[PDB]
């Protein structure tokens, strides 16, 4: 690359890892969408919500591909592992798995920031904080709040009205 | 499933295989998009075209997930294999690889149609013909035509003007 | 909290301290507003200006309450001390007191950033820089410029015209 | 003050006490807003309601500051005591605390009216009746009705649907 | 009067006195208007302001004539005394004279309220509070603030700019 | 300055050096614009592009002068050195010199961030990251991509069409 | 140049000198802009005026660069000398220095017109009269009129109101 400047191989490699982490998260949410689309589960607003989350995570991955290109790094793809489950259990169990995924993504992004900081990558530390860390703490808060509300509404009628009310 | 009717396990499994085929194709096009976004290749209209193709292949996958759910089948995810290459070569070679992928997708859809036909699935034979086979012969024709135009324009200035003129 | 991640008790505590600092600053500005609303002082644009500053400082406090909630910290309220004075003196003296308060708010925000940095809170260092430090240097600059203009316009007619012209 | 006429020191003092009463009530509601914004409570419409009540109580304070200035009295600020609790308990417990606060505010306003009446302040008795006592009986009725509906809806799903339905 | 009910001769007479008080105040302001319209004084916005105040005072009179009629009292006109001066002196002196007049009008309206109160005229006490005591408190505040601003702006250029700036 | 706070002489001096660096870059682009405006070169879109780049670099200088003033630093101008060349050679040679200039500018901004960081200037580190480092990596990427496309289009007809196509 | 006709080396050289004179005048006005943007001076309309004058002088330079190219001359850049001062003193002193710079610009333009006239450059004599001499006498008149008005308004309140009134 004629452009590449103050961009360490360790950071280039960590961005490639994070690209895979985001594509995997997209895959998990696509599977959770399919789950709520089952004809014996049939919660369309939750199914649509997880599809939007899947699209957003794919967007996280492609934005990191774009900054890799801007910095003059080379994207290196890895297998996208299938999610841990096809069947995600109750509404609560699925939102719990989602909170755990968002906390894992955040842990991974904090490690990426740390590597960039260790290598004095003044551009990429700010890029990660602005474009990733801010949305990540809002997503985790969102999922924690959904879990409080799913438990409060309770199974059955509460899950039915949660689907109706929550994603207006 | 209370809905499932005239829907054979062999057909449900074939639909799951095709979902993975389409997700794999989405991944290949995402990789080709990154290739043309390299700062030493820098054909942005071609990079945008392959991103659009990646989006479309993901749509093929999610629409098969939808018809799996409509028929009362259950979606089962597999690993999405990394693409065969990260380096796709020249404009011509990338479009040739894309044509090969579209013909592989078509071969897989024709096999899916044949399994549905063998099991007397009168809904799914028509669904595959209308929603997949028609689009697939159009996609293959588009890629054959792109290859003719890339060869005609030729390397260097032709590749530059193909990027400028063919997608606008 | 199911959300709380990489959020140290020291940072949670310092955010609670800064909430009180901002609520105190809001109170000081409310008192300065009442001063210029006195029938024997009667500078209505300055009174309105200090009320707007009071509103803005209360917004600074409530925004920190929101980020405390987002990070999964717990808000803890303290008494809001009455301002140092009820009589704020001349236009110049009130604006000098306001500049001192803005500099004290900034010193507190820089300390909060320091604590976040020491605890490797990569989210909150950026949050404080973006949402607080940038605003604070523009506030301090605004008050230094007001003070330059009050001095230039001078006591009596200058104060009357400053009130008429400076907030229009 | 060149304006001050038929305005007794006892009434001036009682208006300053009431300004502190309203600022305290504003703080209580700000604290209740934080409680319902906790990620493990997460009743956002209730949180926004208590923030609006906090804004309204602050407006009650600033309107009494304006009439203090109009009558030629001098505003004297006191410490704003922290609320009795940071942790306000159930929806019902918070709304019961709010009703008790509104009744305490009303008792303090009736005492203020009483002092104005005792001193033949024909302007301020009418001002208190029009601008405070009318609003205060409506607010108390509003809170009594909220409590009736919270009890009717009941804990769990009722609290979720009260938050969804009551503030729209 | 077929209408007259709970309306004492003492209150009827006090309303007729207040009508004369308001017509006198209108005449004073008309005289102050002429003063500032002198070709050797030539403060057009102040002259227009005092003409507006003269119009308002006549409105105070005619509104009291209307409520006299509504209550079934009979209007009894007295001479309108010429104002104390034709030459009102400086801007500050005219505004001081204006404030004294507003305070005198206010004392007279509080006495009228007192008479209505003594006679248990529950309609007229409230009418006087709403229609007269509120306006009078704002007018007295207005004139006190004008005097503070005349004093601040100072003589000569300050008077010229007070005329330009103070009345929109 | 009454405003200046946590703003070290070394940082103030470094901001002044960076103002000169940006003004020098503006001059270089102005020179390159004149080169492509020569009647024997006559590539008007490239000439316009380099004039826009000159305008942008001058904006980079004047924004740094603004933040110097906000922080209470004092602007100190130095001579703006004439560019290294008046004759910038071929389209490729000019764009290669531009890339080298952007990388030099980036090296200077990274040094400036480093000085701010050493002096614990929490405001200015973030300001440089947000306002300078982000744009600088995008500019460098843009110039690397221009060079790839100039080489691909090739000399003569390619340069003619590059000028026609690349800036439209 | 295939275009160059009736264009003497002495005139080509003098246009290059005048380009440097205009770029220098732009730099002086940018410095004066920074001076009025100081937090202890804070005359924003004057700061904006001098920034507009800096932009105008840069436009004078780029317009001469364009006529150099039209006539088939070659632009040759020289160092842009830093202004005489960073600190320009009072409002009057700044406008006095501006008047002197405009008079120096005019002397330089009249010398350029003289050289063109001596070399019988019938195009460039008219070009300089129309595009430079007409604007130059208007700019000198404007700066002489500003100085008259700055002295009339006087230092302190006059400078404050000159900033408010003169550039609207
Ligand atoms: Fe993500
Ligand atoms: Fe497909
Ligand atoms: Fe603040
Ligand atoms: Fe209240
Ligand atoms: Fe009246
Ligand atoms: Fe730059
Ligand atoms: Fe000029």
Automatic annotation (TrEMBL), chains A, B, C, D, E, F, G:
Reaction equations catalysed: 4 Fe(2+) + O2 + 4 H(+) = 4 Fe(3+) + 2 H2O
Keyword field: Iron, Iron storage, Metal-binding, Oxidoreductase
Binding, Fe(3+): 22, 57, 60
Protein name: Ferritin
Keyword DNA repair: no
Family statement: Belongs to the ferritin family.
GO terms (BP aspect): intracellular iron ion homeostasis; iron ion transport
Enzyme Commission number: 1.16.3.1
Keyword hit for Oxidoreductase: yes
CDD domains: Euk_Ferritin (cd01056)
EC class: oxidoreductase
Record's function text: Stores iron in a soluble, non-toxic, readily available form. Important for iron homeostasis. Iron is taken up in the ferrous form and deposited as ferric hydroxides after oxidation.
Species name: Caenorhabditis elegans
GO CC annotations on file: cytoplasm
Gene Ontology MF annotations: ferric iron binding; ferrous iron binding; ferroxidase activity; identical protein binding
Classification of source organism: Eukaryota, Metazoa, Ecdysozoa, Nematoda, Chromadorea
Ranges of residues in domain Ferritin-like diiron: 5-154
Superkingdom, taxonomy of origin: Eukaryota
Residues that bind Fe cation: 22, 57, 60, 102, 136
Any Pfam family the entry gives: Ferritin
């Amino acid at each position: 690359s004629l452009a590449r400047q103050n961009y360490h191989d360790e950071v280039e490699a960590a961005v490639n890892k994070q690209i895979n982490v985001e594509l995997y998260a997209s895959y998990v949410y696509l599977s959770m969408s399919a789950h709520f689309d089952r004809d014996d589960i049939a919660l369309r607003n939750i199914a649509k919500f997880f599809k939007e989350q899947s699209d957003e995570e794919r967007g996280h991955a492609t934005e990191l591909m774009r900054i890799q290109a801007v910095r003059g790094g080379r994207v290196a793809m890895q297998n996208i592992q299938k999610p841990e489950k096809d069947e995600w259990g109750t509404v609560l169990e699925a939102f719990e798995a989602a909170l755990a995924l968002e906390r894992a993504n955040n842990a991974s992004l904090l490690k990426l920031h740390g590597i960039a900081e260790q290598r004095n990558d003044a551009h990429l530390t700010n890029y990660i904080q602005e474009k990733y860390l801010e949305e990540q703490v809002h997503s985790i808060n969102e999922f924690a709040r959904y879990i409080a509300n799913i438990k409060r509404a309770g199974p059955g009628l509460g899950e039915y009205l949660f689907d109706k009310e929550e994603f207006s």
